[model samples]
Target chain A: VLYVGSKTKEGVVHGVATVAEKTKEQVTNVGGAVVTGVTAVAQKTVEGAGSIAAATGFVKKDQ
Target chain B: VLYVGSKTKEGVVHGVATVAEKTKEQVTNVGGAVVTGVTAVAQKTVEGAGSIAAATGFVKKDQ
Candidate 1:
């Protein structure tokens, strides 16, 4: 909800796109904290991040 | 709010992690909705999830 951010419809979308990029460093920094606990979530998180990255072209979809 | 789900304090943690995973596919599916002009926003979104994913072991931290 909050992560969607706010502004206009245009604003939220723009915000998400921007927020994602800016946050990459900090997010990636802390991603390891979770990996230490779990595996299934690890698989899912990896796929999830990859999907989002691919969707936005962070890593390329390859497929 | 609702995406946080419920069970207990522990539930919130598990749910958030789970939510993040499921969310990737949903976000990816809807990714085409953006991009009318600037690819800079692309940089934003990519780093957002991709950064965290990389840290979390979603893609493997080469660093």
Candidate 2:
């Protein structure tokens, strides 16, 4: 299982249609076997890079 | 922290409760232990599957 960390802090990810689109080819690019489940969204204040931190979990698509 | 990739693709997870619902009992089954945090939202362009990408993070809850 590969954990995908995102820097983009802008939208909401819910449902299957929307997430299916988000998966894209990046899924395979990230070596994610299966796009299992999206965890709850959390926001944290950060400096330098961006304002908030957005992180996600991506599996190998099978595992 | 375990990353959760979504094949769902449509929904907004901002607070603890919403995420809590999304999480449901699946959390324990997935080994989430507990739903601690959710990352900011991001979208990406891709092919094969849908059109957008959605991702988030799920801690072990105790972590």
Which model scores highest in lDDT? 2
**Candidate 1 C-alpha lDDT tens digits along B1-63:** 543433312101121211222222111122222211122121123233333122112332343
Clashes of 1: 9
Report model 1's TM-score to 2 decimal places: 0.13
Residue A39 alpha-carbon offset, candidate 2, angstroms: 1.9
lDDT of 2 at B41: 48
- Predicted complex 2: DockQ: 0.08
| Highest TM-score model number | 2
In candidate 2, what are the lDDT values of residues B1-63, reduced to their tens digit? 355642333334443323222323222223112222433344332222221233443422431
* CAPRI level of candidate 1: incorrect
Candidate 2 — what's its lDDT? 0.32
For model 2, the TM-score of its B chain against the native B chain is 0.18
Per-prediction TM-score, chain B alone: 0.12, 0.18
